[PDB]
Amino acid sequence: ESNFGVDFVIHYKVPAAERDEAEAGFVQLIRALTTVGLATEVRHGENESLLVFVKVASPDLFAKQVYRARLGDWLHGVRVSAPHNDIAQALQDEPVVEAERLRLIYLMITKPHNEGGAGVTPTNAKWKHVESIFPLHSHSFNKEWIKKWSSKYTLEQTDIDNIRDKFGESVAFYFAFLRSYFRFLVIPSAFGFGAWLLLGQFSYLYALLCGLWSVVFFEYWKKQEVDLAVQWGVRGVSSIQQSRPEFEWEHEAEDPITGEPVKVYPPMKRVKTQLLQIPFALACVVALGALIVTCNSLEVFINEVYSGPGKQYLGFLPTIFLVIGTPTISGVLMGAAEKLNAMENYATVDAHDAALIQKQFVLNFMTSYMALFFTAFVYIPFGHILHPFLNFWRATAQTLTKELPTREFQINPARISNQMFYFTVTAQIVNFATEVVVPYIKQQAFQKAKQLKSEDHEEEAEFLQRVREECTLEEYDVSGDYREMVMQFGYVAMFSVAWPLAACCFLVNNWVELRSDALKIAISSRRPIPWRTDSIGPWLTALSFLSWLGSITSSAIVYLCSNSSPLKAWGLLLSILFAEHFYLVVQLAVRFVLSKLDSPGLQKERKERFQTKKRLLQENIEHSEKITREALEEEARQASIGTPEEMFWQRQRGMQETIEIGRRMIEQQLAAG
Template sequence: MKENVELVFEICVVIPKREAILKGDEDFDCGNVFAKELKNAGLVVDRVIGNSDEFFKVAAPLETLGRAAAELRIMKRTHIGMDLQFDMVEVDAFVKQPDGSLFSWYERFQCYCHLMHGIVNNSKSSRILKFNRREIRWEVGEHLLPKLESEIIIKQIFPLHDDKIRKKLLKTWALQWWDFTTQPVDEIYAYYGSKIAIYFAFLGMYTQWLLFPAVVGLIVYFIDYGSANLVVLPAFFIAVILWAIMFSQFWKRKNAALLARWPITYGNAVDEEYKVVGMKGNAQPRQNPMDLIKLLEADRVKGKKVFTKYEWFNHLLRIRNDALIIISIICLQLPFELAYAHLYEVLNKDIIKFGLTAIYLATIQYITKLGGKVSVKLIMFEHNENPETRADSLVYKVFGLYFMQTYIGIFYHALLHRNFGTLRKVLIQRLLISEVVQNLIETSLPYINYNYKKYAVRQNKEKEEKGSSGTFQFTSRVEKEFLKASYTASTGEELEDGLFDDFLELALQFGMILMFACAFPPAFAMSALNNIMEIRTDALKLLAMMKRPVPRASATVGAWLNIFQFLILMSICTNCALLAWLFDEEGKWKIEPGLVVILIMEHALLLIKFGFSRLVPAEPAWVRAARAKNSSQARDMYTKRLLRTISGGEKTRELKKIE
């Protein structure tokens, strides 16, 4: 199992800087014991002394990763298309990653977690460890890593950037401006994992597709068609709805093609048992499904009853939690949003409106953050299968809060007052000011936070070394990386990472430009320009301003695609309402030919929305053909092996009879 791969330190363990170790205590020192145990597990350790902390950089040779993968029973894609448990002996049977490595970043991360958490006290008695004059008892059979974390000896564990690959991606991705939307998706997958790669693939495709409605929207808005405007706007509306429907379906095809290109095994997307970095594994009061399966095998009648009870309890629990969120939104957030929209409409002075908006933004930030925390608490008691299903549950709940916050004021201006002038001002404000401010915050806050931490370390160091000469500087790259912000979600790090906020921003933008397309067609051009910048700022944020994120197993956009589909349905209704008011200026709601056409158009578009999935397959033909070929090969192989087993068994029985 030899592979010419340069050994790279991919994980860092941080402990506080220790006082001078007393003579004779070297073998009992926590740092020395931990480093020794890591080496015994087959890992390579490089210790770096920083200004206020000590850093253990950890790397794993291929043989060590292979042993851990076999122990974890990681499923990997084979050359015949089947997903089988990894075996070091038959390593040549498994498909390599696009970058030529045997294991993906997610698989390597799983192996690191397993190896580090697998360190236990196998001696016959407890061991005394020392740290800064403290004594810690390491009991027999106790895991070392959780013990040191509970004693606040291990401060943090985080993935390290590979400086060589990071610099290459900076050049070919974050700082590459010649092609606005093309990205090295395979390299992003190899370095960050499938979830982040899928986000950038989605963002790139979405931005490419935005160019068509952007151009058409500018033409519709800036050219005066006179009386033909009543025909042009409905035509534009139909075009953008068909565009959105096609985009969602063709994204499914691209997602399927990416999954076929990357050797991703869904058997690996299990519930992580480790609390290593960022994404924390959360213990839930749930029954182990394996216990239910054993019960079903032992007593089929009783097992079915228990399974049915378990299934319906899970469904009712989710329904209860969703109902609590919906009722909270209707009873608490909806009146607040309507009150703000009404006051904004009736107030005359701009300075008062500005002050009202400032109070509103501060309050709504608190409400949404509180709602996110409540949603996380509710999800902790749901019986979800793995972290990704829990994350999807969080997405649905928190998006409801943001949907109300973002759109209810716009609906108020559009539906109740029919004030298209105010509606356009609000849309321009949200699209220009909000998105620009959001991008500035995304890029500036991590930078400010990083420099503040550097300043704090510098001040502490100068206090410790009063009277010392020389200028202070950070000598190690790993210490600078430790001071950078983590890629976490605004709702917290329990269930989601920073992709939650990035996808949320896209979804809110998509809903805004699509649901009010007839009111402000240039919104598509503004969003296209913003997204071109978004690709670069998000890439720069991940590569230069934040720690390397923890990889996630999922290889789809998950719940966000359903949210985009929901926004398409909403946009059909809202745009038809906007067009109806253009034909019904007096507000008498007479069933005239124009209104009849709009109602017919709405029903036709809804039918097209639900029928288009039948016309455009969700998978390309070559993906289906490759899967069918792999399934046929696997079936033939198992059939031949089974026939040999049966034939061999019959011959053995015949020989026994003759004897």
């Protein structure tokens, strides 16, 4: 029903080996926790673990730290205004939300000891026994949240603000991105269904209208991202995160803006190491891309040119050979990339996580579209370059057992429609299996293992059984649901011209996905620690790269596929050159139009930043004789001791003397004529 007012849960695995040192660390832990100012409780959890429940003891002592955290946000420019001069008045204007409370408790348990409470981050390895620090769910809210989101057709802005109030900003930006992406998916589903009825397959008019859509959505999200940023009070929070515990710093120096001592690193030594990302990425497209092509070279031999026995039995040979390789070789390439960003020496935890994405994006670019790059550019337009690869597999299949029967090779034009039919409606359903219900069935099977093996009080018995169940769940990553939506945006921007019902079917997926990822937070993951992010992250560069490449590839397809005369190469370069420059001129139009549209987000900051300069300010016929007072003064001060320029101003004094002298010169100039 409800938690026992508990803020956080520390798992603290205690193994058989190093048992006395874990107990000595257990005394060292809870004596460190009680000095921060939070009440502790230890309970019987798993077979070798001790659930350490913590809440903050004094709310008045806690209200001081909230006031110091809100002041620290405004001191660095994050908050739009200063807090109130009276304590507990700014807490009464806006209260502490459940997300901001769990963030400051987590920063009490995870910060260096000199500047903060206790260093219970497990990455320090002074204690390797702390398994995880995680907050608890409240199942009264999750039953209300899934019921409310499934009942409504759309989501109001106040519904996503409930996610910001309880699950932090970094979770709430995903649902804010997914809602704005689902509503902007209505537009290319409209003429995407229209280009399926009026126009033919591979319409050139659709490829220009889709390239218009991919930049009017992406630029509008950049306007709505900074609008949601200052609305939630989270703006410019790139620099405000604690540094990583693993960080090599050349010399500690003075901070330029902050004026405190901070560990600084020369960025040109990092740009020297950041230059190595290009020899890493070019090894990625060869290690993965030659693997995708070769298993695509297999299927074009088994399916089309083959008339032997067990044709469907050998039809699963390319697929089951592909799903073995791609998690294994990308697992290797994720290993070297993890040693690359560790070598890159990222200070804050956000920049370390974001550049891990840019290495994780290149692999997931190659597991996604390399099956469609080979079909759209090598199989369909000129499959006769594939004939020596068909001459290879014809030689090796003769060595199996007489000659095996082959048909003459014919380019099947329905391949890219059938390949897109996998990625649009078939891959989405099996992903809907793997995202929610296959974890939910696996939670049932792990529950029955507890019943196979088959001390608490009257009210703690169901609660402690819930926390032990909640603890084995993995931490939710908001990166994992960004990868699914950006790769889905890749199919619309690059490859929806080959199958214009893609945006119509991706639309009905994201209505489910907006309520299925909400269900994934509820029952299939423990609550993540509420982090603050000013932006969506590094995905803006990922969305802009697919949008720019979507202009090239969707227009290179529609020249190479619509003829299915024989592919003059000047037409291919011209079909790119007009459409790639059509993307740039429209991007210059949409960026200019939204620049002229008013931003209500930035104005509410600029209104208060002006007005806070005003409140610092507000706390801190008779004028002709004053000129004659000065004219006597500039005489009497300089006549005591130059004198040519002094006498020039004193020929005429006051006003009415200078008028009547000027009146004579109008007479004197007119009298000569």
